Amino acid sequence: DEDETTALVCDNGSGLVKAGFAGDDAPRAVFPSIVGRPRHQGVMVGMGQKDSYVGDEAQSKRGILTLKYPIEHGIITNWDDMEKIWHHTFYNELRVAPEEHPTLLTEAPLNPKANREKMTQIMFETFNVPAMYVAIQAVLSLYASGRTTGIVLDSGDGVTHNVPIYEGYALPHAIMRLDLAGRDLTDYLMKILTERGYSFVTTAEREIVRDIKEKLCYVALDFENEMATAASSSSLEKSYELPDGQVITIGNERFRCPETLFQPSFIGMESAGIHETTYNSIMKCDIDIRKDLYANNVMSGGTTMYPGIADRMQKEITALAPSTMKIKIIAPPERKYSVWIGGSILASLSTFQQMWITKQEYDEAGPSIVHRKCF
Numbered sequence: 001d002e003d004e005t006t007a008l009v010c011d012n013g014s015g016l017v018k019a020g021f022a023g024d025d026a027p028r029a030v031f032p033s034i035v036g037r038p039r040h041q042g043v044m045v046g047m048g049q050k051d052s053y054v055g056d057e058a059q060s061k062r063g064i065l066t067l068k069y070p071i072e073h074g075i076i077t078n079w080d081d082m083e084k085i086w087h088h089t090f091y092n093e094l095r096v097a098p099e100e101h102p103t104l105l106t107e108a109p110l111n112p113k114a115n116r117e118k119m120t121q122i123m124f125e126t127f128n129v130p131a132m133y134v135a136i137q138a139v140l141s142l143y144a145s146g147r148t149t150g151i152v153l154d155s156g157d158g159v160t161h162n163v164p165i166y167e168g169y170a171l172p173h174a175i176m177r178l179d180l181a182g183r184d185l186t187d188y189l190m191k192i193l194t195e196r197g198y199s200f201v202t203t204a205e206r207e208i209v210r211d212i213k214e215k216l217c218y219v220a221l222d223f224e225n226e227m228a229t230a231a232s233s234s235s236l237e238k239s240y241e242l243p244d245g246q247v248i249t250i251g252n253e254r255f256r257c258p259e260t261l262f263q264p265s266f267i268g269m270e271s272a273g274i275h276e277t278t279y280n281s282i283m284k285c286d287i288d289i290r291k292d293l294y295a296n297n298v299m300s301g302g303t304t305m306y307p308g309i310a311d312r313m314q315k316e317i318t319a320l321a322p323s324t325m326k327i328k329i330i331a332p333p334e335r336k337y338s339v340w341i342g343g344s345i346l347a348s349l350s351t352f353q354q355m356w357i358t359k360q361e362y363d364e365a366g367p368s369i370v371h372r373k374c375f
């Protein structure tokens, strides 16, 4: 753009599309990736200004809407809303044509084979984007935190991932994937809420369950001990008087839902928490590779933003791992935009040119150009 090539960086997942230009610190355009439709019906003369209420516009006028969620855990429920989602991004906020710049996105690690092509097509065959790359999440983070080896656990909204990374990159044989992440914490809440006598069961209320969560519910440091502290109506109970009108006195639910990350005996599964799946990744590798993975355990995404989390893993991780060392969780001050800031650098370095898919390479290699360059 202007005197230089430049581009647009983009982290999109199951909950927020976070768009910006290139070189930038952290995001500019940001919106929930959802498309809403008018479930309230009746008729019209005056109308609340939309056919598809999208992202921001959507989340703001919740009531009439049946919020068609798309990317639940990297898999999209149906792709049709998605084109309107990205129709926001470029033209409406950023005012830039996709048909002009490079695009950086993120690979929501182990998003299916065909989704790679299907995405690149929406750009290159439908909306002729000049160059693009989708970068594989967890690793980006590492470099922005100034780390080369460590065990990263990156989870935002959609899917849990425990990545061992070193001075050279990981492989499917050791890394893991699980469905128990940030948004599942979000949704989980209502399964449990029943015992007080609440269950925001439907659409608009579904979104209020997310909202409650990120600004008040905290992680149990050691749940079991804290269970008797549920008698202490001070720590726990707090008022959420919904600005509509209904008090949700989120007592024990404020840490009982977080705990499911380290405790799947609460939903019903055999998954161990993210502290044990971290051993699960780390063990599977070569024998000499672990000493510095243990020296830095990178912890990022929307998932690691709750109050009381690094500290937890400090205890828990020691118990079933290798013993010998200075074990240490590195969770950056803002650690959620891990994906984004690591990505920024790549789409600011011109060295990145000895990688990407450029506009004519697609035509010259068909849809498959994505697995002809990448994987």
Ligand SMILES: Nc1ncnc2c1ncn2[C@@H]1O[C@H](COP(=O)(O)OP(=O)(O)O)[C@@H](O)[C@H]1O
Pocket: 011, 012, 013, 014, 015, 016, 155, 156, 157, 158, 182, 183, 186, 210, 213, 214, 215, 301, 302, 303, 305, 306, 336
């Ligand atoms: N302060 C926070 N504490 C905990 N949960 C948060 C916080 N900020 C956002 N979240 C949750 O993180 C998720 C969105 O994270 P995000 O990184 O934006 O996207 P995604 O991994 O899908 O790419 C949602 O569950 C949202 O509720």
Ligand SMILES: [Ca+2]
Pocket: 011, 012, 013, 014, 155, 156, 157, 339
């Ligand atoms: Ca993400």
